[PDB]
Amino acid sequence: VSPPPPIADEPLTVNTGIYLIESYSLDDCAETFKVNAFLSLSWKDRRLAFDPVRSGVRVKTYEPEAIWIPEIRFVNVENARDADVVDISVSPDGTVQYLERFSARVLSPLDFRRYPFDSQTLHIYLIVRSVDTRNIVLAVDLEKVGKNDDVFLTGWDIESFTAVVKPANFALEDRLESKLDYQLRISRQYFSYIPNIILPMLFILFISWTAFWSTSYEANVTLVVSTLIAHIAFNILVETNLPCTPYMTYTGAIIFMIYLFYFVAVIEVTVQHYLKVESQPARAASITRASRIAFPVVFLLANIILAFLFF
Amino acid sequence: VSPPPPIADEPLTVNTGIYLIESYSLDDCAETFKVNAFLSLSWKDRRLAFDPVRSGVRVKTYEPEAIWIPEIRFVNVENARDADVVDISVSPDGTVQYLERFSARVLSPLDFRRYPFDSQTLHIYLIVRSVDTRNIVLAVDLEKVGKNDDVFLTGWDIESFTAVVKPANFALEDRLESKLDYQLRISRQYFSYIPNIILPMLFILFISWTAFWSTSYEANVTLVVSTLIAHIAFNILVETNLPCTPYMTYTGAIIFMIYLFYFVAVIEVTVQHYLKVESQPARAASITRASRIAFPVVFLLANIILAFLFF
Amino acid sequence: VSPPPPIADEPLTVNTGIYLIESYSLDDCAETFKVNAFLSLSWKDRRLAFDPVRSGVRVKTYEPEAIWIPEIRFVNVENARDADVVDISVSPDGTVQYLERFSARVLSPLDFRRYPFDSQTLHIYLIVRSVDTRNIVLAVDLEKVGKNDDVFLTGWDIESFTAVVKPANFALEDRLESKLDYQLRISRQYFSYIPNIILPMLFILFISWTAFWSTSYEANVTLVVSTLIAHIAFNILVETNLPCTPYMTYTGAIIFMIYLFYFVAVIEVTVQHYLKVESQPARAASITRASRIAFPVVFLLANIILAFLFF
Amino acid sequence: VSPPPPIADEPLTVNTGIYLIESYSLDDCAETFKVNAFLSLSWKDRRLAFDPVRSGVRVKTYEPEAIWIPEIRFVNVENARDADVVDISVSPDGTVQYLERFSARVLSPLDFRRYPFDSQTLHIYLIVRSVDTRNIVLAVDLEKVGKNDDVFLTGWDIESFTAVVKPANFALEDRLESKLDYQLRISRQYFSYIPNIILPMLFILFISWTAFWSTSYEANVTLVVSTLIAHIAFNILVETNLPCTPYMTYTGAIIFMIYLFYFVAVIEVTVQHYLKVESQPARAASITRASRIAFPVVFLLANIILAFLFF
Amino acid sequence: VSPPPPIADEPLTVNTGIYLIESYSLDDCAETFKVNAFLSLSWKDRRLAFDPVRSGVRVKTYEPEAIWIPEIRFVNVENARDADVVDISVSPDGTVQYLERFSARVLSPLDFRRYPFDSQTLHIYLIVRSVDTRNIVLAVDLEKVGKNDDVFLTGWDIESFTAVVKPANFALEDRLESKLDYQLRISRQYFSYIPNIILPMLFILFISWTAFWSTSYEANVTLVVSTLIAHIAFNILVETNLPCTPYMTYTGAIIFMIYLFYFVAVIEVTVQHYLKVESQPARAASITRASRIAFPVVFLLANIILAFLFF
Ligand SMILES: [Cl-]
Ligand SMILES: [Cl-]
Ligand SMILES: [Cl-]
Ligand SMILES: [Cl-]
Ligand SMILES: [Cl-]
Numbered sequence A, B, C, D, E: 001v002s003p004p005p006p007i008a009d010e011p012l013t014v015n016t017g018i019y020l021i022e023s024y025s026l027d028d029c030a031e032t033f034k035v036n037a038f039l040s041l042s043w044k045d046r047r048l049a050f051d052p053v054r055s056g057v058r059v060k061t062y063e064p065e066a067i068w069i070p071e072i073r074f075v076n077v078e079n080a081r082d083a084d085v086v087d088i089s090v091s092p093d094g095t096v097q098y099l100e101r102f103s104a105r106v107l108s109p110l111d112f113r114r115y116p117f118d119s120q121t122l123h124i125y126l127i128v129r130s131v132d133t134r135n136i137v138l139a140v141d142l143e144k145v146g147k148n149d150d151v152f153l154t155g156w157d158i159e160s161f162t163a164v165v166k167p168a169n170f171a172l173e174d175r176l177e178s179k180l181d182y183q184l185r186i187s188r189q190y191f192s193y194i195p196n197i198i199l200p201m202l203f204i205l206f207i208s209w210t211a212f213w214s215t216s217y218e219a220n221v222t223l224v225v226s227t228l229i230a231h232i233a234f235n236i237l238v239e240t241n242l243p244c245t246p247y248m249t250y251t252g253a254i255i256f257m258i259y260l261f262y263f264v265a266v267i268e269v270t271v272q273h274y275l276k277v278e279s280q281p282a283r284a285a286s287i288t289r290a291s292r293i294a295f296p297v298v299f300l301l302a303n304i305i306l307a308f309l310f311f
Helices: A193-213 A217-238 A250-277 A281-310 B193-213 B217-241 B250-277 B281-310 C193-213 C217-241 C250-277 C281-310 D193-213 D217-238 D250-277 D281-310 E193-213 E217-241 E250-277 E281-310
Strands: A012-027 A032-044 A072-074 A082-090 A095-107 A119-129 A136-140 A156-172 A175-188 B012-027 B032-044 B072-074 B082-090 B095-107 B119-129 B136-140 B156-172 B175-188 C012-027 C032-044 C072-074 C082-091 C095-107 C119-129 C136-140 C156-172 C175-188 D012-027 D032-044 D072-074 D082-090 D095-107 D119-129 D136-140 D156-172 D175-188 E012-027 E032-044 E072-074 E082-090 E095-107 E119-129 E136-140 E156-171 E176-188
Touching: A012 A119, A012 A156, A012 A175, A095 A119, A119 A136, A119 A156, A136 A156, A136 A175, A193 A217, A193 A250, A193 A281, A193 B217, A193 B250, A217 A250, A217 B217, A217 D193, A217 D217, A250 A281, A250 D193, B012 B119, B012 B156, B012 B175, B095 B119, B119 B136, B136 B156, B136 B175, B193 B217, B193 B250, B193 B281, B193 C217, B193 C250, B217 B250, B217 C217, B250 B281, C012 C119, C012 C156, C012 C175, C095 C119, C119 C136, C119 C156, C136 C156, C136 C175, C193 C217, C193 C250, C193 C281, C193 E217, C193 E250, C217 C250, C217 E217, C250 C281, D012 D119, D012 D156, D012 D175, D095 D119, D119 D136, D119 D156, D136 D156, D136 D175, D193 D217, D193 D250, D193 D281, D217 D250, D217 E193, D217 E217, D250 D281, D250 E193, E012 E095, E012 E119, E012 E156, E012 E176, E095 E119, E119 E136, E136 E156, E136 E176, E193 E217, E193 E250, E193 E281, E217 E250, E250 E281
Parallel strands: A012 A136, B012 B136, C012 C136, D012 D136, E012 E136
Antiparallel strands: A012 A032, A032 A095, A072 A119, A082 A095, A119 A175, A156 A175, B012 B032, B032 B095, B072 B119, B082 B095, B119 B175, B156 B175, C012 C032, C032 C095, C072 C119, C082 C095, C119 C175, C156 C175, D012 D032, D032 D095, D072 D119, D082 D095, D119 D175, D156 D175, E012 E032, E032 E095, E072 E119, E082 E095, E119 E176, E156 E176
């Protein structure tokens, strides 16, 4: 079959609608999310019009093979969506009402810089390539754009499911293409992060600061180096909870700073020992006494600078 | 083919039944479980009515392509189920008895707050979208709802397989949808958790408490800090056994508390040393002597409080 | 097509045979294994009988679509098997010789209680659902049940591939079902376990026992606690080699006991130190001297008890 | 259908063009990447020529089955691409404008020697096997070779998507094969590697150098050995970040050198102690004093040498 | 279609060839390797013979559906190969020249005993099952057996791609089967193994040996135990590089021996301390002095013995 012919020289409008049934498998590393939804399509084909009085039925139901259907594809999918045509409905004027249920793995880039206080906009881009006989343009029927109340993505608050009504019409491979941006807005449930990541990580670092109320070089070497091991071990433990970003994140910056602090605490411990050994105990004692306040203060400050620097 | 026509204006009743053959791959992280079951369907399609005497046969057998079959889908599946029609049997009144064997990856949210003493209700939601000519309504034939005795989910006790008889009939995208809730009830086999997770984790903590019968600051630093490392390594070891919950679980609150205890034990060890060093050995000794009882008591109390809050 | 009609009132006998070509992907955690095998089927359909003289042929070859074929399925598969009909052959009496090559992922429960001295019986359950016109019964042709010599499952000795001749005939959803139990017997190759798991684990534990020839509390704390870390580190290293059982295994009991031993060794080390410190060195010395024999003896006794309980 | 016949003795030219829609799953270990793109094909088939006046059409649209289409394959794919013919258009002269959307997993060797300062050229090799009647030759239409602006590969800067215009025409299995090299140029985003990999790794090594301002053999053994553990623990933490190269990398050579440094630091610590114990404290002190400069200077010198060898 | 009829009573010869296009995904654990190649087939079908003169063609080209093609399968594949018929060409005598491009996941057992100095022979077994009318026998056309020069398997040197010309003709499921052994010979690239695995592992063990130049029991306990932890940590670190063998490998024998050495070093350290403490310092000193030579010598000797036993 060929596309419906234009009355004048106008493009064909395909009214689209996505209704989210299920959201699952948000892969932080792959930057992909699996989605199960309805895709509704509507357009006028006058070749399929009929006088309801002459005809035999109000609405004529067709098989996909029987009539012309626009080839709608998704831009940001790994492979083509798995679709199952639920219904095709032709009214007396030739207004086609298409409906399919599809599942797809959608590639949408993620920004982990504010982890775990991040929010994401997941995109589903609808596209239609224009044909030889006439141009095809996508449109949004907002009555057919929604999401099931039960839609969930463990660890996230599902904010909204909307579409940018104005399509992106552009040329590609010598033909017009009309694109639609459907947006799923999600924000992370950051609470567990405090008792799970930050708090135990801070306790380890705080244990290293006890070296400031000790003069035993052996006990101090043990405190600093053994906590450093505990820190790395704890990091190994929480690897999984942190996302795949091969770029600097807020949490990643706190963590880097904590590594610097272990190194500085070693310097202090080393300095204090050398001074004592090299018969300068008054300096050694004044440095250790200062560090007791200097360490928490410089830490707490650098964290406000970090927080501010990120938010 | 079109749906069977109504005699008056009545909806079509599709009598459903699911019989569980196999239950497998319960993914605590994905919140998905895989299923292999029979799906039985029964409706009346008078266009198929026959005379047993002319036909010879008491029951007619058809291929799925030959007759109209209702489009039943599952709401909470990853992709459409893999189905194989086992049998289609038409009696002369036009009553169709459909049967298929299907496998599906079902998405059902899980609540790990009580892990490992958690129980779950797994849902399989059956759905049918009504058509232009007539409304379709789902029903439950309880004689056809069951599960194979051999059905297992390693680590769980399979309690029951039932269906909420009353369907959820509602409107969606300008058409009626009739939904059925099939429930698989499971409860976790928590025993192994004691010798596997808790007991070795408690022994490590108890070793740290021996610092309360020691005055050697070096030996105490080694006890606390090395046990803390042992705890983190033990935690990495049991990572897998613990579920994916990005929220606070019961097992999780105990693990957080154990981290707090290591920090408090460090404070004590540090305090006791400073007092001794700052010529106050009587206080140092009274604090250590108190700690011996304080630590187990406060621990035992806080664990009772936790259990109470979670259960 | 309909099933062949009964001469009297007899059920139809389908003679089955499975010949294992390949066995791969034994997943200890999923309790699943993948299989590539031939499935042979045999029955008599007198409607297919021919006079070889008129036909000029001794044997007629058919396409699966052309004739009636019994619907054989497997009970314990994740999804339906991938099959390719190799041959369909008909002899003048109406005897059908069916053959297909199939691959399938089979779910079979495993018992890890005796690991690594465990043996497993893998099950492949063949099934046929009876029809309205006649009952269908499965049978085993043992000449037709075999396995390729090259069939392997790394880490296991493939003992036998057989079938329990007597089918399990039972009623399900108001129809007869004839089931066949095909068994693949495997026994674990436990040798590598000694140099890979037990021996290094025992050496670490034996190092902690040297604390019984030392009076240095600091050296003893280091011996017991550092070996405990080494043990946990070693467990982590061997995680993979140990299976997924969420229940107590033989190796699992030994490992738990080894954790108890580290705790007891700490108690001793702590006790010996307190007694010394609290001016009772004779008791401290007698406890340490006893421990030297008590520890290996109680260990060796407890292991004999465990072995006995498990075997 | 047979290929279009030659007017003289000329080969058939198939003008190709790949337009990258999506790029995902760059697997550093597998040396594979996934791609979603348009494949455009152009050729003149005079048998398809038509008079637009008689036909009433300016352009004829065909189904792939209806006309002859060249069999284009990709050399370096895991399995054959998943393709969906978007459009086939014929103009009155017999020009065929083919277009398909395809997804494919591409195998392209990677060179990790300069990690994380490495750049890669990804290859997608297009191929056509010539037929009995005429030779088929591939060509590149550069206007039709592009990539979507949104194309990303997390951790990489996507430099260019081009094709080596000159095809590689060669004989294989007694027939001509015309090959096209499509190149996707990528360069690694190395910044995060400094705060993530190198800096914490260098701090650990620097802590070991403090043993050169200490005479306590016990404190020194703790410094060197505990940092060695921390280093190994740190590598385990960053295993994932480093690529799969089973050959020597730049990062890899630095890491090996750091292991040598821990060994040398042990020798020093051991030597200094033996001399001190064997009543030669002046030598012990001069060795330690030298080490303070020798260690950083030699490390710095060797890194300069390494950088030079790799760049 | 039926197979070509025999002139006398002779079997049909199918001349085979495999030309390796791609070699990828060699999975050491699964013992599977992925292949992408051409499969060439040639056989005589006199029903297809023609006179070039009254036909006008030198060669006739057919569609797979038009003529009879032998059903060639692979024995050791997980699922059936993905094939795409490239060309079918009949010469005047009736000789068919078939060609397809296929990809397949081949199961071939691997022997890791000599790792990393191990070589492997990967098998691709071609098979044809004989038919009712005539027997089918496989043959090797060596002109059509090859591999692309660019064929690679990261970490291996691709030695050769050959076929054992003489087929293995045998009976299976009451019918003749003709098998062909195609061999891909690979040998491992063992270089980084030295700087990556062995060298850092030997440095850790050498650090432990420093305890033979020390009399401090505390320093010695720290040296032996902390290096033991570092060793285990290093193992956890190199797990990935070592293959899946659940049997004793060459590298694995060295590793086991290294565990024994840590245990022996502990015994020495313990013995030396007891003797000193029990007023026998001359024996303690002579044992430690001996150990200094005994340890490296016994190590170097048993390594020579092991190498000899494995090679
Ligand atoms: Cl799509
Ligand atoms: Cl479904
Ligand atoms: Cl099956
Ligand atoms: Cl391809
Ligand atoms: Cl195959």
